[PDB]
């Protein structure tokens, strides 16, 4: 019918519009967030196709090196660190903090502080 | 002011960033 | 019914579903990014009603000890730390890492460790 | 595979987590 046709057309417009609305806010909101966690925690967190987390420090000595954490994570479990070129360099640290203390946050924090100290004018 | 879908959208996502 | 109407009904459903499926994906993903951010950095980043950032240590003495940051400028990547009840207890850490050195990373890093130190290991 | 809507949707989101 003429009423049905026109009545339905509005639904499509609205839904299509919602899709556009949804994407814009979400894109904008997510981008702003990630900046906060970088600016704040001094780690950029990148998801890989494999849902593994790659962290690159703000104070990283080299652009190329970074850390990658992978999780079995069906649930919110604890991740296990996968070896990277950078990861080998910072031995001990891991022993002290991950192997022994078992706290990823302590490891990063320690690492972050360490990197800062190295960062020097000359 | 604020459009409806946007308002609707905004609330859904903003909820997604708590507890 | 009408071939014209049928198309709209099918069109509508997909579009509703497309938004529908899309919203679901964020749920899984957003949580998955946060919990990773949380277990790794040892901080839960929440965005307030006033679009301020509220941080809470995985090692918090009591719950509701949080910290709040507000972006000074939307464009400018630097955030002021707002006074809060828990902020009072870290006069020291603030003095050293936030003004003397102007580094949230340093500041949080060094805090995460102090709080991690006060964990009854009984 | 996966249904199409989830698929395009999924792709859209994943690209957001990048530099």
Numbering used by the authors:
A (entry chain B), C (entry chain A): 597 to 718
B (entry chain D), D (entry chain C): 459 to 477
Give me lines lifted from the publication on this model.
The Mad1‐Mad2 complex, which is required to catalyse MCC formation, is targeted to kinetochores through a direct interaction with the phosphorylated conserved domain 1 (CD1) of Bub1. Mad1CTD is comprised of an N‐terminal elongated coiled‐coil, followed by a globular head domain featuring a conserved RWD (RING, WD40, DEAD) domain. Each monomer contains a long N‐terminal α‐helix (α1) forming the stem, followed by an antiparallel β‐sheet of four β‐strands (β1–4), a short helix (α2) and two C‐terminal helices (α3/α4). Bub1CD1 is largely a single α‐helix, consisting of almost four turns.
In each case, the asymmetry of the homodimer was retained. Crystallization of Mad1CTD‐Bub1CD1 with a twofold higher peptide concentration of 5 mM led to a lower resolution structure most likely due to the twofold increase in DMSO. However, the differential occupancy, although reduced, was still observed in this structure. Thus, this peptide is likely to bind with higher affinity and to represent the single binding peptide in solution as detected by NMR, ITC and AUC analyses. This model is supported by our Mad1CTD‐Bub1CD1 structures from various space groups where higher occupancy of the second Bub1CD1 peptide correlates with a more symmetric Mad1CTD dimer. Alignment of all four Mad1CTD homodimers from the three different space group structures displays the extent of the flexibility within the Mad1CTD coiled‐coil and head domain.
